[PDB]
């Protein structure tokens, strides 16, 4: 694409008369005459009287907005389809946008997933951190330091305003999920006068401490695990047993044997038709994936029943869904993009004592996710080694002129807990719409109570009353 040139739309190669095109944006907005990024867009034209475009972001970070728009199209309320062009976009560095963040080969990822990743002795910590340093080196080798430095949400928000103008909208109508609510609040702060409407489903509090938010997310997934297990306990054949007070214990009786009990570095994978088998780390990841929605609880139950017989096929497939590894062993770039974006969106945690204390607390908060006992050591995260500095700093959202917005928060959301949505709505001086459930996000996913509130807000600007629940 040509910087400043309008989007050339062409039929995508797909539901509707979907149109696809690219938009050029500067890599560095302070160097407009420099390197350029090409953002991939998809557009489903409105069927009635068009108000404008409804631009979505599915979250992640690292998740394709084009893929999400294709999914949302199938569950879009008729009224929204009539009045809005549904538009998805791949953020800079993500999926079909170019250049795309790449760090790991398919083999790099496969080799890491084969490891139990439970050894937190000094030797185990050293091994993890060495792997992490080699990962970062690969990101730098394949991507520019310059491109890595500018993939953050602060620049995504600027890209979003360019997208708004390229779509012909005077003002933005935006729906953001999870991480996408950070795009939303960043956009709201820099372009408050351009915001027509914003729905933010699954909230990120930009003023949160990174460690406490991580521990609240650990608690969220343990809460979800507990709700899954109490449900399972009522059902015949529950692989975690009929006593939910012992479900964590029984769970570990199923996954812990995937680790050599005398050498925590040795995997004893459960048998699968796939040549990989099921490692302990993939078992945990596959469990986390299933706790995103009750619609995946049946799959977790199938996966744990398989583990009773030392089989791991379903948990492996759940982990592959989390990692976005397709049936040919190919990963999309969501994993690498997620890290690179997260590491520039706030100052990383580099203090060893804080990281060690975090692991001590996480083991108690989310025992389903921890193997063995606290060792007194824990590895630094990937961002502690990141080679370019943060481009955003934690702070409370301040956008006093912003139109009323709607934050949707699910009471037992494991990934973006409920209270984070309460806090974000407070900072935005917006409306809080509550959904009672144990899932991450809910908008345009089959609930007419939620969707009716959202439709009325998008079309007529009507916000839900204080205390609205679905
Ligand atoms: C999304 C896949 C890539 C993960 C980031 C690359 C760093 C690989 C080395 C870390 C090994 C994983 C063990 C530590 C993970 C954690 O701290 O929770």
From TrEMBL:
Query: What is the protein name given in its UniProt record?
Result: Protease
The chain's coiled-coil residues are none
Which EC class does it fall in?
hydrolase
| Gene Ontology molecular function, alphabetical | peptidase activity
InterPro entries named in the record:
AB_hydrolase_1, AB_hydrolase_fold, Serine_prot/Carboxylest_S33
Q: Which Pfam families match?
A: Abhydrolase_1 (PF00561)
In the record, biological process GO terms are: proteolysis
Q: Which parts of the sequence belong to the AB hydrolase-1 domain?
A: 54-446
Q: Which keywords belong to this entry?
A: Hydrolase, Protease, Signal
UniProt cross-references to SUPFAM superfamilies, sorted A to Z:
alpha/beta-Hydrolases (SSF53474)
